[PDB]
Amino acid sequence: QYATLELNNAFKVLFSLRQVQAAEMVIAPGDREGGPDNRHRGADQWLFVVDGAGEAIVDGHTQALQAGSLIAIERGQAHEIRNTGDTPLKTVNFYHPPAYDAQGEPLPAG
Amino acid sequence: QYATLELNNAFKVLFSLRQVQAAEMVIAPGDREGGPDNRHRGADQWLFVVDGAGEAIVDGHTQALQAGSLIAIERGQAHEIRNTGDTPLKTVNFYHPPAYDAQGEPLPAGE
Numbered sequence: 001q002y003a004t005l006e007l008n009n010a011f012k013v014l015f016s017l018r019q020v021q022a023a024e025m026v027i028a029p030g031d032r033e034g035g036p037d038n039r040h041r042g043a044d045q046w047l048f049v050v051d052g053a054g055e056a057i058v059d060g061h062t063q064a065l066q067a068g069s070l071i072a073i074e075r076g077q078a079h080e081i082r083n084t085g086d087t088p089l090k091t092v093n094f095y096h097p098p099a100y101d102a103q104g105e106p107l108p109a110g
Numbered sequence: 111q112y113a114t115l116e117l118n119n120a121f122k123v124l125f126s127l128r129q130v131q132a133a134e135m136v137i138a139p140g141d142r143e144g145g146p147d148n149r150h151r152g153a154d155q156w157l158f159v160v161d162g163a164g165e166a167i168v169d170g171h172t173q174a175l176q177a178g179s180l181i182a183i184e185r186g187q188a189h190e191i192r193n194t195g196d197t198p199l200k201t202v203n204f205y206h207p208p209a210y211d212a213q214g215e216p217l218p219a220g221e
Contacts, residue, residue: 005178017182020206068115072127096130
């Protein structure tokens with residue numbers, strides 16, 4: 001499967017393969033986006049930063065994010081990614097197992 | 111788990127989490143890298159291009175790669191990634207299940 005990411009979508013589900021799902025996520029300055037938690041289907045989230053700067057908030061601590069950062073957040077944790085810089089935070093994400101339907105809505109728990 | 115990729119390693123494994131393994135791979139102009147096949151542990155390979163141009167050769171067909179390209183190559187297929195451009199082909203890769211040990215050598219066939 002193939003796609004050319006334009007990195008201009010707030011959240012766009014790309015495609016899945018054997019229980020791994022890819023998505024494009026661009027966060028505007030001052031914005032933040034959740035992430036899979038325990039409310040819907042649980043999933044690990046792998047996030048790679050193409051550009052911009054920000055932070056990942058998880059369980060009670062933070063991880064700074066910059067161009068080139070790769071973070072793997074294990075399923076079962078409330079978390080969010082926030083753009084703390086002044087330029088778009090462009091990211092590519094991988095969920096294991098898949099966490100969303102094609103429209104970007106979370107899959108149901110269990 | 112966290113890491114800041116510098117994108118200057120030919121192949122650096124990284125870390126794994128629940129059967130998914132990440133690796134940095136930078137292919138110099140004119141070079142190629144053969145991903146997991148059926149000789150060692152089988153694994154799907156997800157490759158995202160950060161910089162550069164090239165192509166994925168899977169079986170008997172090709173797929174052009176450019177900055178922003180994301181390709182998912184299913185396990186069990188002989189394939190390679192080649193840099194047909196004149197600048198470094200910088201990529202980040204994800205393998206499911208893990209396909210290499212910490213030093214970058216393929217894991218044996220049959221887990």
